[PDB]
Amino acid sequence: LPEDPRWELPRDRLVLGKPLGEGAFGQVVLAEAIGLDKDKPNRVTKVAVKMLKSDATEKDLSDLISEMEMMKMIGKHKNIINLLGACTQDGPLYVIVEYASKGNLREYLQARRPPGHNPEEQLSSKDLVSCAYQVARGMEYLASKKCIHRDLAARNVLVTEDNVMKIADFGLAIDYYKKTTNGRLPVKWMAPEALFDRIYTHQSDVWSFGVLLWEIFTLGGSPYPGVPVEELFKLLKEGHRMDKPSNCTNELYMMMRDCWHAVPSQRPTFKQLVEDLDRIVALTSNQE
Numbered sequence: 305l306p307e308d309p310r311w312e313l314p315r316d317r318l319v320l321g322k323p324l325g326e327g328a329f330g331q332v333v334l335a336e337a338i339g340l341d342k343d344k345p346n347r348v349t350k351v352a353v354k355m356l357k358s359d360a361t362e363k364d365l366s367d368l369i370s371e372m373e374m375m376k377m378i379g380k381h382k383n384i385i386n387l388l389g390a391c392t393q394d395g396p397l398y399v400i401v402e403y404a405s406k407g408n409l410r411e412y413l414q415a416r417r418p419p420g421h422n423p424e425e426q427l428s429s430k431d432l433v434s435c436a437y438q439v440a441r442g443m444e445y446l447a448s449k450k451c452i453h454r455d456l457a458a459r460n461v462l463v464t465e466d467n468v469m470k471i472a473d474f475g476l477a478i479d480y481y482k483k484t485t486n487g488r489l490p491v492k493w494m495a496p497e498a499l500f501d502r503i504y505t506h507q508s509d510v511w512s513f514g515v516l517l518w519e520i521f522t523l524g525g526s527p528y529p530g531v532p533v534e535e536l537f538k539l540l541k542e543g544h545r546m547d548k549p550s551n552c553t554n555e556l557y558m559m560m561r562d563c564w565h566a567v568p569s570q571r572p573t574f575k576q577l578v579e580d581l582d583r584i585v586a587l588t589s590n591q592e
């Protein structure tokens with residue numbers, strides 16, 4: 305492949321470590337980058353490295369290269385997983401991205417549920433809304449760069465050591481029965497027009513963002529538990545809408561319902577959700 309000197313890091317500057325994301329995002333490993341910043345060559349940064357598996361096909365390689373090229377195009381934001389570099393020359397392709405040490409948002413929320421399980425950390429109402437605000441800001445950035453996610457879900461949001469929310473897996477462009485690493489059905493986050501008419505827009509990502517809000521306020525709850533694909537289809541045709549979680553305000557439930565508008569044009573934009581969530585954070589108590 306051609307050397308892009310914007311992004312090239314010498315192979316000997318990368319110390320590869322243990323695997324990370326359960327295989328969900330392909331072969332991803334924790335690594336240490338020496339002198340990632342040309343400005344600071346004696347500093348190590350923990351990073352995530354994506355590479356090809358042993359029995360990888362030509363398409364598999366094509367998908368990895370495509371994903372990296374998209375991330376250069378999309379550019380940098382606080383609330384997305386950012387490209388940091390690549391090892392393209394003289395060995396296997398390595399794509400180097402930001403490391404989020406507290407894992408996906410579903411895991412992060414579940415680990416901070418109140419005791420039954422005795423957790424070491426607990427989240428205020430302000431913390432939950434702040435999570436929602438950060439995802440909305442990342443999505444507003446990606447939409448502004450004309451990027452449609454197509455799988456927005458707490459499982460595709462990663463949390464850093466500093467509790468920053470980062471949208472992942474936005475750079476890649478369908479078996480309705482295939483389940484997640486965790487055993488859930490991705491069709492349960494899809495807008496009806498995406499599910500039935502294969503039409504994917506920023507508006508269908510807002511619908512997914514509605515399901516993600518529901519995941520946040522249930523602290524990593526599973527949408528439509530025990531509902532198979534055929535029954536989900538009937539629920540959507542009948543216009544079913546999930547119940548309001550306990551410990552969720554009328555205002556946040558109405559935001560969820562607005563994200564789930566049957567008419568795509570009538571859903572709020574991510575620009576609108578960022579403004580509304582900004583106001584709500586400032587007015588939400590951190591005392592419980």
Ligand SMILES: CCOc1cccc(-c2ccc3c(NC(=O)c4ccccc4)n[nH]c3c2)c1
Nearest residue numbers: 324325329352354399402403404405407472473
């Ligand atoms: C070039 C495409 O790179 C991609 C694509 C899709 C996902 C990722 C990715 C996956 C996982 C991570 C990650 N951290 C983790 O996966 C993780 C998991 C459990 C416990 C602690 C950390 N930090 N950064 C990542 C980036 C990288």
Ligand SMILES: [Cl-]
Nearest residue numbers: 459484486488
């Ligand atoms: Cl999940």
